[PDB]
Amino acid sequence: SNKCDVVVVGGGISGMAAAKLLHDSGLNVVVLEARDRVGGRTYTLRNQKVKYVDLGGSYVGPTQNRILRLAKELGLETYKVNEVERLIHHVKGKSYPFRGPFPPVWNPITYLDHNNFWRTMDDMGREIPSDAPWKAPLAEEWDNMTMKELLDKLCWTESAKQLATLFVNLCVTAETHEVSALWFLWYVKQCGGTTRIISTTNGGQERKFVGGSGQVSERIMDLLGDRVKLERPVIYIDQTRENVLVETLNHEMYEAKYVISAIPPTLGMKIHFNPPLPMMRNQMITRVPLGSVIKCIVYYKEPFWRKKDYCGTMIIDGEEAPVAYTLDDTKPEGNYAAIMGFILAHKARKLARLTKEERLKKLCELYAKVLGSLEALEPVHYEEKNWCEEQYSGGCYTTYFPPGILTQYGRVLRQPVDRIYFAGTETATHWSGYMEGAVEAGERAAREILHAMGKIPEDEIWQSEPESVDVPAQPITTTFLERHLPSVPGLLRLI
Amino acid sequence: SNKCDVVVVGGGISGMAAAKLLHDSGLNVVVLEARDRVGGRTYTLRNQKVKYVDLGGSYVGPTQNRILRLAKELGLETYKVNEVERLIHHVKGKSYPFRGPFPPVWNPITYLDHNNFWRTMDDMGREIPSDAPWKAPLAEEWDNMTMKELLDKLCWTESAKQLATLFVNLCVTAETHEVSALWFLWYVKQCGGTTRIISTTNGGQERKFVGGSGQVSERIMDLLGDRVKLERPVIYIDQTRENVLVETLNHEMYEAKYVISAIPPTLGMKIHFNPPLPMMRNQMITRVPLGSVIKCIVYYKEPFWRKKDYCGTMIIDGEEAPVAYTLDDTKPEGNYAAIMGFILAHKARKLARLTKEERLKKLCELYAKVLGSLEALEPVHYEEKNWCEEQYSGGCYTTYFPPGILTQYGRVLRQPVDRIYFAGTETATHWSGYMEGAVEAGERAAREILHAMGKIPEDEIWQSEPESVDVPAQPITTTFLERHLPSVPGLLRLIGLTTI
Numbered sequence: 001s002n003k004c005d006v007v008v009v010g011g012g013i014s015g016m017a018a019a020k021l022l023h024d025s026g027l028n029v030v031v032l033e034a035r036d037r038v039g040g041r042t043y044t045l046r047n048q049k050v051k052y053v054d055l056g057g058s059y060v061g062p063t064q065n066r067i068l069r070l071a072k073e074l075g076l077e078t079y080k081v082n083e084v085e086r087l088i089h090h091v092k093g094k095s096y097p098f099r100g101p102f103p104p105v106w107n108p109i110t111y112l113d114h115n116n117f118w119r120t121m122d123d124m125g126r127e128i129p130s131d132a133p134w135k136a137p138l139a140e141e142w143d144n145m146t147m148k149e150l151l152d153k154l155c156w157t158e159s160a161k162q163l164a165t166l167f168v169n170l171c172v173t174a175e176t177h178e179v180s181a182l183w184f185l186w187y188v189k190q191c192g193g194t195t196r197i198i199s200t201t202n203g204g205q206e207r208k209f210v211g212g213s214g215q216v217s218e219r220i221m222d223l224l225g226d227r228v229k230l231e232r233p234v235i236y237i238d239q240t241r242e243n244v245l246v247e248t249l250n251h252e253m254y255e256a257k258y259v260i261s262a263i264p265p266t267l268g269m270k271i272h273f274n275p276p277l278p279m280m281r282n283q284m285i286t287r288v289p290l291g292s293v294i295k296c297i298v299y300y301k302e303p304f305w306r307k308k309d310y311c312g313t314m315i316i317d318g319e320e321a322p323v324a325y326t327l328d329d330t331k332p333e334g335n336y337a338a339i340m341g342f343i344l345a346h347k348a349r350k351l352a353r354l355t356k357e358e359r360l361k362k363l364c365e366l367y368a369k370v371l372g373s374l375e376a377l378e379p380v381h382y383e384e385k386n387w388c389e390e391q392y393s394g395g396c397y398t399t400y401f402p403p404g405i406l407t408q409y410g411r412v413l414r415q416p417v418d419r420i421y422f423a424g425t426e427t428a429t430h431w432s433g434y435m436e437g438a439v440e441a442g443e444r445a446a447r448e449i450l451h452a453m454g455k456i457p458e459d460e461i462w463q464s465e466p467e468s469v470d471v472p473a474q475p476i477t478t479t480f481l482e483r484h485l486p487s488v489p490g491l492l493r494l495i
Numbered sequence: 496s497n498k499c500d501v502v503v504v505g506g507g508i509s510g511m512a513a514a515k516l517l518h519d520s521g522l523n524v525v526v527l528e529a530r531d532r533v534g535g536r537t538y539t540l541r542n543q544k545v546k547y548v549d550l551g552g553s554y555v556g557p558t559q560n561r562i563l564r565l566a567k568e569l570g571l572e573t574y575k576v577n578e579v580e581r582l583i584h585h586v587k588g589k590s591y592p593f594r595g596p597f598p599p600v601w602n603p604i605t606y607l608d609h610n611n612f613w614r615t616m617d618d619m620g621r622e623i624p625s626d627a628p629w630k631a632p633l634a635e636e637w638d639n640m641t642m643k644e645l646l647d648k649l650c651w652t653e654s655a656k657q658l659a660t661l662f663v664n665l666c667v668t669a670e671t672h673e674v675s676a677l678w679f680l681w682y683v684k685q686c687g688g689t690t691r692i693i694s695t696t697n698g699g700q701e702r703k704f705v706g707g708s709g710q711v712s713e714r715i716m717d718l719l720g721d722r723v724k725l726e727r728p729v730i731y732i733d734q735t736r737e738n739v740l741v742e743t744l745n746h747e748m749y750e751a752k753y754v755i756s757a758i759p760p761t762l763g764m765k766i767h768f769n770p771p772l773p774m775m776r777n778q779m780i781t782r783v784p785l786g787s788v789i790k791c792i793v794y795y796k797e798p799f800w801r802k803k804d805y806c807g808t809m810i811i812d813g814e815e816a817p818v819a820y821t822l823d824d825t826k827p828e829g830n831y832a833a834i835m836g837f838i839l840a841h842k843a844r845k846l847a848r849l850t851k852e853e854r855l856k857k858l859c860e861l862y863a864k865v866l867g868s869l870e871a872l873e874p875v876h877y878e879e880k881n882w883c884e885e886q887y888s889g890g891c892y893t894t895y896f897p898p899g900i901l902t903q904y905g906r907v908l909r910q911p912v913d914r915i916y917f918a919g920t921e922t923a924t925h926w927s928g929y930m931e932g933a934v935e936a937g938e939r940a941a942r943e944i945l946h947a948m949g950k951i952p953e954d955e956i957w958q959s960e961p962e963s964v965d966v967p968a969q970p971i972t973t974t975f976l977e978r979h980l981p982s983v984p985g986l987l988r989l990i991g992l993t994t995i
């Protein structure tokens with residue numbers, strides 16, 4: 001058996017960040033990676049037609065200081081996602097160009113209803129602790145409802161309900177009826193709220209890495225050399241003896257003092273445990289699916305939308321559109337012109353039966369309609385990735401909680417099992433579900449082990465992160481009117 | 496590699512029924528079983544204090560003709576669960592003895608709401624095809640709701656909502672807010688409807704096997720000899736070559752023409768697949784958890800409840816009650832007096848924290864109050880089993896579907912993946928979740944392979960079962976008033992119109 005201090009299961013950003021921290025402290029680490037590559041839910045493809053493209057996780061923004069610091073140390077640089085020109089909201093077959101992060105509403109009733117919906121999401125989130133959403137005062141009430149039920153209660157207009165629905169689908173790649181209200185409200189709150197999570201400028205979609213996000217995992221693998229073992233899916237963890245034994249599918253045996261599980265919670269099911277896991281974890285890892293998404297990038301000779309004062313951001317309502325949201329994927333030099341679109345949730349399941357060429361045609365015809373340009377019909381290249389088909393991801397972007405699961409099982413996610421500690425973006429308390437959360441969780445799980453070894457004190461397990469000098473955060477502001485305008489039922493009670 | 500025609504993964508009733516049919520058709524089968532025993536979600540404990548006791552699946556009834564035929568062919572007998580004396584409905588801290596399958600209701604408004612609740616469950620059920628629930632006309636609308644949301648709309652009284660909530664918790668060991676309304680309505684309809692599923696006499700809980708249900712899997716193991724491999728958890732299935740390769744955790748390798756997966760759907764996650772599963776199954780097996788239950792059996796010197804004219808059946812409402820449902824578990828000879836109780840859904844999670852001794856104490860104190868009997872505080876013995884802790888079950892009784900899953904993923908549940916066919920009770924069309932469903936699914940998957948090998952025509956894959964001559968099924972009937980009495984909103988509509 002191959003002996004070390006710590007076995008990290010998974011070479012995504014979380015496992016790699018944990019292995020780097022432990023290695024830098026002088027421990028002997030092995031990373032066991034199921035795939036022939038590192039990066040997990042990040043994947044940068046290179047070819048002459050795209051140069052590079054992020055087919056998985058890509059965007060970083062202000063307040064994501066851990067991923068910005070790790071990336072910067074590895075020698076990576078960011079560029080700004082194009083948002084110079086106007087965004088488009090496509091509603092009932094027509095494009096309404098706009099500026100600022102929220103699509104505007106002109107009907108006064110619809111205005112009140114939209115304003116109330118976003119405000120209520122943040123008002124609710126203020127009562128949900130980031131590190132313990134199950135301790136929200138109304139935790140059971142909110143956990144025993146879907147986001148569909150909450151939206152049915154909150155939204156007096158079909159206008160607000162359809163945009164709120166698009167918001168849920170885009171944020172967590174799942175249907176409003178699939179997900180706990182408590183979990184979704186926590187999810188928004190722990191990215192800093194609605195403005196911060198939906199914003200390009202001054203939010204989660206502000207920036208991409210020059211050369212792709214896959215370089216974070218690749219360059220940590222560079223540092224660690226042959227400590228990273230590719231095509232070693234873990235099948236068996238034995239904790240009955242003095243050292244932990246980890247076995248891979250290719251029959252190799254690893255022996256360590258501790259283990260970091262840096263895999264999506266439900267992919268814990270692929271591992272046979274001795275002794276069996278405690279009951280709550282045993283059932284938890286069956287209750288925590290990942291969402292459904294195809295990430296699709298259509299390439300054009302030029303960023304032609306910019307000539308019409310469109311930035312390439314499209315918010316597209318309605319069942320018929322295959323893609324509900326797009327960003328300009330053009331490289332900083334203005335070349336490799338491209339539109340990134342997501343095929344989300346039930347549409348990812350529905351449209352996966354088509355050919356690649358059939359999806360390209362549907363996307364080009366949608367983009368031609370929304371951008372009002374025949375140039376959208378003349379793509380020069382297409383890349384896509386269906387994350388639903390990934391045995392060692394389970395989906396993307398992240399794990400969602402169905403109704404009732406977070407209050408019953410949420411406590412178990414980070415709870416150590418003997419000498420196994422739990423990393424993965426799912427265990428983060430800030431930008432859980434993102435590359436930032438992957439870094440937070442890996443580093444925390446690594447410091448839990450340093451503390452178990454007596455190397456650091458308890459108060460050093462969770463560590464704050466200084467603000468990026470390169471990507472500083474501006475405050476989220478609200479207007480007097482946004483804060484005090486009544487809801488629709490509010491305006492009724494006042495009549 | 497050990498060579499055969501068919502590897503069966505799982506030595507539950509489903510896997511063993513498959514293996515037996517294939518073996519009887521003259522094929523070479525191997526059963527790879529993870530545990531040191533067959534039976535899976537059935538488990539008969541034997542010791543001198545209890546003689547035998549079912550800690551997993553136990554009850555069989557009318558219309559479950561496949562498990563009754565299989566058990567009869569293996570030399571097993573049934574006996575009737577005690578329903579001679581009165582049942583008890585315990586609500587707001589008081590016990591109301593009754594007869595017949597449903598706890599009665601005297602308040603006329605409450606009576607209409609209760610009658611409308613059960614009636615509407617079966618009415619919606621008749622819209623849902625047993626073999627394709629996602630083809631129901633309102634499949635999408637029903638699948639996008641929880642059972643909690645459906646009870647909130649249907650029940651105009653708290654009385655009906657509370658009883659309906661207990662019915663869901665007991666039937667599928669899950670909370671109303673956890674389960675799809677479509678899936679639950681399907682689950683009840685594919686058992687023959689509300690009356691058949693809830694009933695002891697004339698329903699699912701009518702009988703048990705003399706000597707325990709574990710004998711079904713054990714006796715098929717006896718027929719199969721060394722073809723059954725215990726402590727062979729399957730870790731890897733390879734379909735990239737001419738024959739399928741099946742690898743176990745002890746590094747043994749099995750080579751076969753075909754595989755039957757006879758394990759709970761989510762436990763497919765414990766197997767590494769080459770090539771990868773198709774997308775829809777890849778994601779479905781992360782979306783289908785099992786329910787939560789502790790089965791608890793408290794033993795007494797005598798079945799003292801019978802002397803107060805209680806059969807031992809208790810339907811117990813309220814958060815404080817650790818157990819919502821009990822049945823007499825006394826042996827047919829009248830000895831090893833016992834009460835069987837289920838701790839359901841969130842209470843299986845909450846009370847798992849306690850010791851065995853603390854759970855025994857809470858159950859005795861509950862039983863003493865409900866039966867109005869201090870004898871209930873004098874147990875002689877206790878057995879229990881928390882199915883939440885089983886690595887190779889994932890829960891009990893069965894797989895439930897959360898909102899949105901049955902319409903998006905339900906169709907791939909028994910869709911073959913190249914040379915892998917799917918058994919297990921979850922893939923049944925009649926009494927899915929039960930031992931009956933395990934037999935139907937196992938025999939159906941076996942016959943799918945017999946068809947693939949050209950040994951039978953397609954019309955022999957699905958086969959009807961002759962009615963047991965030993966456990967005949969009384970039909971389910973309604974009275975004129977049950978069929979036609981209005982709902983509470985129906986009555987308010989009548990009132991509205993008269994008054995106009």
Ligand SMILES: *Cc1cc2c(cc1C)nc1c(=O)[nH]c(=O)nc-1n2C[C@H](O)[C@H](O)[C@H](O)COP(=O)(O)OP(=O)(O)OC[C@H]1O[C@@H](n2cnc3c(N)ncnc32)[C@H](O)[C@@H]1O
Nearest residue numbers: 010012013014034040041057058059234396425433434435
């Ligand atoms: C898929 C995706 C994700 C995504 C997104 C868009 C798509 C299409 N957009 C994002 C974005 O713009 N910005 C951002 O910050 N995040 C975005 N996401 C999510 C993001 O990619 C993830 O949050 C992050 O990558 C998660 O990292 P983490 O390290 O937590 O997890 P992982 O990448 O899934 O890595 C797990 C690794 O474990 C290996 N594995 C799995 N099972 C085993 C076993 N049994 N043995 C050994 N290794 C195992 C995986 O193969 C993987 O490498």
Ligand SMILES: *Cc1cc2c(cc1C)nc1c(=O)[nH]c(=O)nc-1n2C[C@H](O)[C@H](O)[C@H](O)COP(=O)(O)OP(=O)(O)OC[C@H]1O[C@@H](n2cnc3c(N)ncnc32)[C@H](O)[C@@H]1O
Nearest residue numbers: 505507508509529535536552554729891919920928929930
């Ligand atoms: C647990 C339970 C179940 C139950 C019930 C009460 C409890 C507490 N009450 C029932 C009742 O009164 N009447 C009835 O008909 N059913 C009742 N249920 C449900 C019933 O027990 C189940 O429907 C039935 O036994 C399921 O049979 P099936 O054959 O489909 O599935 P299984 O019993 O889970 O068997 C699966 C076997 O597979 C092995 N396994 C799991 N993973 C692997 C791997 N990777 N490799 C090899 N083998 C594996 C399991 O160990 C098991 O033996």
Ligand SMILES: [O-]/[N+](=C\c1ccc2cccc(O)c2n1)Cc1ccccc1
Nearest residue numbers: 101102103163166167170171197198205
């Ligand atoms: O919410 N919005 C953007 C969003 C959110 C979460 C993401 C996660 C990963 C990758 C992304 O590109 C994400 N984009 C836009 C929006 C604004 C107003 C109404 C509806 C929708």
Ligand SMILES: [O-]/[N+](=C\c1ccc2cccc(O)c2n1)Cc1ccccc1
Nearest residue numbers: 597598658661662665666692693700810
């Ligand atoms: O539904 N009832 C019993 C039932 C149903 C399903 C089962 C499945 C497995 C094992 C069992 O013991 C089961 N018992 C009684 C009842 C009647 C009226 C209201 C609420 C409850």
